[PDB]
Design an enzyme around this catalytic site. Sequence first.
Site, PDB file in Angstrom:
ATOM      1  N   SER A   1       0.857  -1.219   0.000  1.00 26.67           N
ATOM      2  CA  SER A   1       0.000   0.000   0.000  1.00 26.67           C
ATOM      3  C   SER A   1       0.879   1.250   0.000  1.00 26.67           C
ATOM      4  O   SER A   1       1.761   1.391   0.849  1.00 26.67           O
ATOM      5  CB  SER A   1      -0.933  -0.002   1.212  1.00 26.67           C
ATOM      6  OG  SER A   1      -1.644  -1.225   1.310  1.00 26.67           O
ATOM      7  N   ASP A  76       2.154  -9.889  19.601  1.00 24.05           N
ATOM      8  CA  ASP A  76       3.271 -10.581  20.228  1.00 24.05           C
ATOM      9  C   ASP A  76       2.876 -12.017  20.543  1.00 24.05           C
ATOM     10  O   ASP A  76       1.743 -12.281  20.959  1.00 24.05           O
ATOM     11  CB  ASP A  76       3.713  -9.883  21.516  1.00 24.05           C
ATOM     12  CG  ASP A  76       4.413  -8.569  21.256  1.00 24.05           C
ATOM     13  OD1 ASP A  76       4.165  -7.958  20.196  1.00 24.05           O
ATOM     14  OD2 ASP A  76       5.223  -8.152  22.112  1.00 24.05           O
TER      15      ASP A  76
HETATM   16 CA   LIG Z   1       5.213  -8.776  18.200  1.00 23.18          CA
END
Ligand SMILES: [Ca+2]
Lengths: 527, 192
Positions: A1, A76
Amino acid sequence: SNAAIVGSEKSATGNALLFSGPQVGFVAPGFLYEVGLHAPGFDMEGSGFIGYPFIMFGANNHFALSATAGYGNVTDIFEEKLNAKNSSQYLYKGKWRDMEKRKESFTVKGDNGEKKTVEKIYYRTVHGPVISRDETNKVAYSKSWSFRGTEAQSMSAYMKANWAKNLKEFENAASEYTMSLNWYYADKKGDIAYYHVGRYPVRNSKIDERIPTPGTGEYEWKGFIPFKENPHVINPKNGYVVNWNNKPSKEWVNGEYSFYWGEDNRVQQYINGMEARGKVTLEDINEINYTASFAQLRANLFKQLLIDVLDKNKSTNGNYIYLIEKLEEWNNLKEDENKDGYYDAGIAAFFDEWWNNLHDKLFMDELGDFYGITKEITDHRYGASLAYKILNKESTNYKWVNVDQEKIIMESTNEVLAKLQSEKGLKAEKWRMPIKTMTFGEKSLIGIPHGYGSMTPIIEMNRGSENHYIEMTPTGPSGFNITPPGQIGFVKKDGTISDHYDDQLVMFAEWKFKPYLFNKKDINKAA
Amino acid sequence: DKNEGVKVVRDNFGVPHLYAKNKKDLYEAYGYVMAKDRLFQLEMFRRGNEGTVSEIFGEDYLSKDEQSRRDGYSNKEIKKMIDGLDRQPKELIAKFAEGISRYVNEALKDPDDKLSKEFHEYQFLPQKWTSTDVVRVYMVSMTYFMDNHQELKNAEILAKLEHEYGTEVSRKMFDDLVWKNDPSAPTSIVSE
Ligand SMILES: [Ca+2]
Ligand SMILES: [Ca+2]
C-alpha cells in the site's frame, strides 16, 4: 500500500495534495466500495474496504484522507510453559494457571452436498488464544493482540475521522483508533499530516521482540505507548510525506517485521520522484505511480553497483561496453508502452537474471537448504537490504562472502550474458520477455471466495487496488480517481453481470481516470 | 428520530451518491445501496469471520473457519463491545445493518431478479444483519493486516540455523536476516 500527501509549499498549484494506493489485491467484486455521502454538515465522497460504514480513501468538505495497512508490531507471541502433570496449566507468576476451554462446532458441506458437523476445542491463556503446542517439551504458544476487544472502538474512531471538521478533531479520532495503520491528511488551507495510528504496547526491555516472549509473568506488557509517542508529523519541512510499507521514523522499531524496513525499500521510488521534481502536481504523482507500478526495484540501487564494476573492467571484457550502454540507457522499469506483447527493455531481462544469479551466489551456500523459509527475507518483495549492504561494502554481523564484491558481480554478469547470447541472441532486443498478465480473481486476501472474479487479462502492475488523486482547493476537494473492477458485483441468476461489474478495468489498465465528484452540480451531470 | 427519506443518485459508473436529511437516514441508505451492490460478497466476508464458510464451500475452508473462531469473538462478546460505544456510532452502525437487512428482505421477496447468482448456484439464502455482523465484516479484513505469527517463524529460522552452524554463528546470520535496527532504512518522517 502506497500513499502521498504534499504541502502547499511543495505543491505547484499551492493547494495540498493527497494520493491513495491501497494494495489489497485485485478481485471481482472489488475489495473496495465507492460511495458518496451527503447530509447537513456532512459531505464526503470516497471509497472504503467492502463492509465498512466509513470512507477511508477520499475527502470531505475540510480535508482529504487516505490510509495504508502495513507490518506494524501489535501482535506478540508468548511462549507459555506447561505443567508436566497437566497439559491444561501453565506457569504464570509463581503458580500454575488453568487455561480457558472454548468448544466450537463447524457445519461443513462435505463431498456429498449434505451437511457435516465437526467439533473442535480451543484454549486461551491470559495472553490470548493458544495457536501451537510443542511436545518437546512442555511448551505452548499464545497470541497477544494489542487491540483485542477494541475493534468496535476503532470503527467509531474511523467514523469519527469521517465526521471531523478540522485537524484537531481528526487527530482526536486517530488517537482513539487502536489498530496498526498509517493515516494521511491534507487540508483546504495547505496543511498536511501523517499518523502511524494504533495502540502499541510497552514491552519489557530485556527480551527479544523478534521471537516469542516467555509467558512466566516477568516480561509482560506494561500499558500502551501514549499516542503522542507514535510516529507522526504535521507539515514537515521537506513538504511531503510518502509511504510504501517502510520505517515510519528513524526512531521507530518493528521487531518481528524488521526485514520489511531496510536500506533497500521500494518507497525510494516515490522519494526519487519527489526529489527529482520541484513543486509537483497530481499528474506528477500519477507519473510516479506509473514508475512505481513497473519499477524493477532491484535496479534502483543495484544497477549503479553493477555499472561501476563493469566500468572498472571495461577493457577486460568486450561485452561490458554494450552492457554499460544499455544499462545506463534503461529507465529501471519493465513496461510495455509500445503495446506489443513484450517489455520494451531487453536489458531488464538480463538484469532480472543477473540479480537472481547474484542473490544465490551470496546465500546459496549457507542458506540454500532453508530458502523455503529464508529466501522471502533475502529476496524480499520490497528490497534486498542485506544483499545491498554486502555488495556495498557495508559491515555485517556475519561474513557472508569470502571473496571480493566485483568478482561476484562479474561472475553473475558473465554467466547470465553467456546464457542469453547462446539461447536468445547477441543483442538486447532478443532478450525482451512477454508481458505478465493478471486477472481480478474470486478469492481475496482473506482467503474466501466472494464471487466469480474476471478472466480479463491486464498487465501486472505493482499498483494499488484503487487510486485517488485529490487537490484540496479553496472551494473543496477536487481531482480524479479509479476503483476497479466496478461498483456493482451483482450477477443475475442467468449469469448476466452488472453493466458496472467491469466497466472500470480498461481505464485502470490504460491509466485513465474518472473525475472525482463532490458538489451536487457535477453529480447530476454524471447521471 | 423516527421519520426518514434519502435520495440516491447513480452516476455513469453506478456509484451511489446519497442525500439525506440526517445521519440516521444517511447510514441506513449507506448499508442498503451496498447490500444491493455487493450482497454475496458481504455475505461471504461475514462468513469468513464467523467461521461459517465451510457450510457453503466445503472442507477446503475448514482450517480458515477454525482460525477465525479460535482467535475471534462470540456474538455476546461483540454485542458487549458494541454496547461500549458512544451513542451516535452505535446507532448509525445499527441503522447500517438495517439498511443491509432492508435489501436482504427485498431480495428474498424477488429472488430471481434481486438475489445474485451465487446464492442460486450454491442454493442458500442471505441472513439478516445486526450490528454484530457489521463488526464481523470489519474484523474479517482489518485484522488480517495486524494478525500474524512471524515471531514463531523467526524462532524457526533461528533454530534451523543453530542446528546447522552452532549458537555463535547462527545468531550472527539471524541478526543479519531479522535485524534489530538498520539505521539507513528510508523513512516517511524526515523534517519536522
Ligand atoms: Ca510482536
Ligand atoms: Ca513492448
